[PDB]
Design an enzyme around this catalytic site. Structure first.
Site, short mmCIF file in Angstrom:
data_model
loop_
_atom_site.label_atom_id
_atom_site.label_comp_id
_atom_site.label_asym_id
_atom_site.label_seq_id
_atom_site.Cartn_x
_atom_site.Cartn_y
_atom_site.Cartn_z
CG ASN A 183 -9.92 -11.83 5.91
OD1 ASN A 183 -10.80 -11.09 6.35
ND2 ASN A 183 -8.65 -11.71 6.24
CG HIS A 211 -7.07 -11.95 10.39
ND1 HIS A 211 -8.42 -12.22 10.34
CD2 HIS A 211 -6.79 -11.21 9.29
CE1 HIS A 211 -8.93 -11.67 9.25
NE2 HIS A 211 -7.96 -11.05 8.60
CB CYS A 249 -8.59 -8.24 10.69
SG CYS A 249 -9.11 -7.52 9.13
C1 LIG Z 1 -5.59 -8.19 7.07
C2 LIG Z 1 -6.44 -9.15 6.03
O1 LIG Z 1 -7.58 -9.24 6.66
S1 LIG Z 1 -6.13 -9.48 4.57
C3 LIG Z 1 -4.38 -9.97 4.64
C4 LIG Z 1 -3.70 -9.59 3.35
N1 LIG Z 1 -3.94 -10.74 2.44
C5 LIG Z 1 -3.35 -11.09 1.34
O2 LIG Z 1 -2.17 -10.64 1.18
C6 LIG Z 1 -4.16 -11.71 0.17
C7 LIG Z 1 -3.39 -12.91 -0.40
N2 LIG Z 1 -2.23 -12.59 -1.26
C8 LIG Z 1 -2.17 -12.10 -2.56
O3 LIG Z 1 -3.15 -12.00 -3.36
C9 LIG Z 1 -0.72 -12.02 -3.18
O4 LIG Z 1 0.03 -13.23 -2.94
C10 LIG Z 1 0.24 -10.71 -2.80
C11 LIG Z 1 0.51 -10.68 -1.28
C12 LIG Z 1 1.61 -10.72 -3.51
C13 LIG Z 1 -0.42 -9.32 -3.16
O5 LIG Z 1 -1.24 -9.36 -4.35
P1 LIG Z 1 -1.32 -8.10 -5.41
O6 LIG Z 1 -0.47 -6.91 -4.84
O7 LIG Z 1 -2.77 -7.56 -5.58
O8 LIG Z 1 -0.66 -8.67 -6.85
P2 LIG Z 1 0.21 -10.08 -7.21
O9 LIG Z 1 1.75 -9.79 -7.07
O10 LIG Z 1 -0.14 -11.36 -6.35
O11 LIG Z 1 -0.26 -10.28 -8.79
C14 LIG Z 1 -1.18 -11.30 -9.19
C15 LIG Z 1 -1.99 -10.83 -10.38
O12 LIG Z 1 -3.26 -11.53 -10.39
C16 LIG Z 1 -4.42 -10.64 -10.17
N3 LIG Z 1 -5.33 -11.29 -9.22
C17 LIG Z 1 -5.74 -10.97 -7.90
N4 LIG Z 1 -6.64 -12.00 -7.54
C18 LIG Z 1 -6.75 -12.83 -8.55
C19 LIG Z 1 -7.51 -14.03 -8.74
N5 LIG Z 1 -8.29 -14.43 -7.73
N6 LIG Z 1 -7.40 -14.69 -9.97
C20 LIG Z 1 -6.59 -14.27 -11.00
N7 LIG Z 1 -5.82 -13.09 -10.85
C21 LIG Z 1 -5.90 -12.38 -9.64
C22 LIG Z 1 -3.70 -9.33 -9.64
O13 LIG Z 1 -4.53 -8.15 -9.60
C23 LIG Z 1 -2.46 -9.33 -10.46
O14 LIG Z 1 -2.64 -9.04 -11.84
P3 LIG Z 1 -2.98 -7.48 -12.37
O15 LIG Z 1 -1.90 -6.59 -11.57
O16 LIG Z 1 -2.72 -7.60 -13.94
O17 LIG Z 1 -4.51 -7.16 -12.05
#
Ligand SMILES: CC(=O)SCCNC(=O)CCNC(=O)[C@H](O)C(C)(C)COP(=O)(O)OP(=O)(O)OC[C@H]1O[C@@H](n2cnc3c(N)ncnc32)[C@H](O)[C@@H]1OP(=O)(O)O
Ligand SMILES: CC(=O)SCCNC(=O)CCNC(=O)[C@H](O)C(C)(C)COP(=O)(O)OP(=O)(O)OC[C@H]1O[C@@H](n2cnc3c(N)ncnc32)[C@H](O)[C@@H]1OP(=O)(O)O
EC number: 2.3.1.180
Lengths: 318, 317
Positions: free
Chosen positions: B272, B242, B111
């Protein structure tokens, strides 16, 4: 002081050694065919390690050998076409592996020209005055791309890595360059095709390496000899380190080129085709044997060619 | 010998996929996806690969600019979802547009690939050996994703965008800072090709996988520091980061103390697209007139992701 120079070489290949005899026992091939066709007698094939490990070793060695610590590295460029993942890049794996916290990194995709391309890139970086120290490593693990039943390609490629420690100097070393490519023949040599199998994809578009022998042969002899004469003439060159694909190829180039064959250093008999790692392995090896000597000011040209199609030469003074 | 972006262009698959169509495929909702990323839809190829997407971008840069492929000195493609290991997307693009006079290759920096690649071009031009080139960021994650893992399937989209770069009499690329941390490479990974040769004995998943919080926390902390290295709220006009998550851009704009309206957003329509995120956003901003080449606006381009890699470029458009 923006002039780059190669100041330390190093190589690393899998301990595993595979001879043409062990292959003739796997396919319908012989040591006499393979060898008389390429000059290859043996190769090194990984049994546990991947591209990142091989490169890790080269980097490690450059520091140990140069006394330079990872914190000193400004950047890391790895030229590969058989990386561990699409992401991270082997360069990043290597960076974290040696703790070169201050350097940024990435791999360059230019097949068998990857080292000459990557190297040139580094010169640009140093010349910019922005960066002074870096590692340019060419590493490959084709064994994992090959169809070990297609004798057509299985007998040519080997696994390996080698690189150089590059730093800024007050005197210029990289005299001149000429990088070329021809994507209208990309089909000549290809590997790693990853197919789309998403639920949305509706197109009807082989992960193993496949190449057109004659195409590349004929191409190298012609297009490469031209690219080399662009920079020098027998009279203005001391040594030439070309991609170690086939000795017959180097033999035909030396002839067309009108350059003393003794200047074209050979290595393939022991490593086979290692693509982007061929030239740096040959270089480290030549330095070790004393044929080449850093500081000596020997006029050397590095030329690679292959997948792309890509090819290019670098006229520099060691 | 000073480079300057002189023409932008983008291209994405026609196939539009909304958060609703996805909620239908997995246990996910438009409400969740959107409120955590700001993404409402992506572009998913149906018959196109990375090379095809990049080919259009290039094609268009020439049309728009009136340049002839013969005039291109080089081509750099930042991708991590290439067609083949070899050839490189760059080479395919090169032959596709008949840029016989240019040499090319792809850069593998996830990225951050566009900021990295772009910087690379700068040096090439500055070297005085090259004065025209195409820097394109293209991707097709749809093929890498496990469409049953809602954890990642809802984030990535397909797409490509790039810029036509040529030497100028005045400097544009003011300052830059490229970084990486291979010690957390495990945080985001895809495309692992396993060795199945008769010699391999080791006992070491082709689809993308990533550590959410790792990357989240990382971006907010390390990226904000990186951006402040180059500028401050008063010394910047716009920032194109990004387009991973809007919540991330929010947290960064905060810590960074830079006017939020300066961080242009775009993930709502494309998700993304990794290395293509920034150039798509840039071409879109230019089209919209928010950015205007020649205007000399203080713009910083910052990417972050797989590697880990990240870096910013302070330049005047
Ligand atoms: C560098 C790049 O190119 S990518 C940049 C990184 N991007 C991001 O952080 C993605 C956006 N953010 C996120 O999804 C969250 O807000 C974060 C940052 C807290 C991290 O997410 P996670 O560590 O996977 O878990 P989170 O604390 O949000 O928990 C949400 C729950 O919903 C689940 N979940 C993930 N996506 C979905 C979805 N689309 N719909 C419903 N549930 C979902 C999770 O897996 C978790 O439940 P589970 O542990 O029982 O499977
Ligand atoms: C860019 C790179 O990195 S690699 C550079 C390209 N290098 C090479 O050319 C590979 C090494 N060399 C060769 O393949 C030969 O020298 C070439 C190129 C002249 C062969 O070209 P072609 O015209 O297609 O084949 P040619 O007419 O000479 O016949 C080759 C024969 O060897 C056979 N063959 C292929 N591999 C093997 C092998 N490992 N052992 C025994 N026979 C083999 C072919 O199937 C064919 O048999 P046939 O005579 O029954 O058809």
């Amino acid at each position: 002081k923006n002039y780059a120079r190669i100041s330390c070489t190093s190589r690393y290949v899998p301990e595993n050694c595979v001879t043409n005899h062990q292959l003739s026992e796997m396919m319908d091939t012989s040591d006499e065919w393979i060898h008389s066709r390429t000059g290859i007698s043996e190769r090194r094939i990984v049994t546990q390690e991947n591209t990142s490990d091989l490169c890790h070793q080269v980097a490690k060695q450059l520091l140990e050998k140069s006394g330079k610590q990872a914190s000193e590295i400004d950047f890391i460029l790895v030229a590969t076409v058989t990386p561990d993942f699409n992401m991270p890049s082997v360069a990043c794996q290597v960076q974290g592996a040696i703790g070169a916290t201050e350097a940024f990194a990435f791999d360059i995709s230019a097949a068998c020209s990857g080292f000459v391309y990557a190297l040139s890139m580094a010169e640009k970086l140093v010349l910019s005055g922005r960066y002074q120290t870096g590692l340019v490593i060419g590493g490959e693990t084709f064994s994992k791309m090959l169809d070990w039943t297609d004798r057509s390609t299985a007998v040519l490629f080997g696994d390996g890595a080698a690189g150089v420690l590059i730093e800024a100097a007050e005197t210029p070393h990289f005299l001149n360059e000429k990088l070329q490519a021809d994507g209208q023949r990309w089909t000549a040599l290809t590997s790693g095709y990853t197919i789309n199998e998403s639920p949305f994809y509706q197109g009807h578009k082989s992960k193993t390496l496949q190449m057109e022998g004659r195409s590349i042969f004929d191409f190298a002899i012609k297009d490469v000899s031209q690219n080399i004469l662009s920079l020098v003439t027998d009279e203005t060159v001391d040594y030439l380190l070309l991609h170690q694909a086939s000795v017959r190829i180097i033999d035909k180039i030396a002839r067309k080129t009108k350059i003393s064959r003794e200047k074209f250093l050979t290595n393939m008999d022991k490593y086979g085709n290692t693509s982007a790692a061929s030239i740096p392995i040959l270089l480290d090896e030549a330095v070790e044997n004393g044929t080449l000597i850093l500081g000596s000011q020997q006029r050397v040209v590095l030329t690679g060619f292959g997948g792309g199609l890509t090819w290019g030469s670098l006229l520099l003074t060691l």
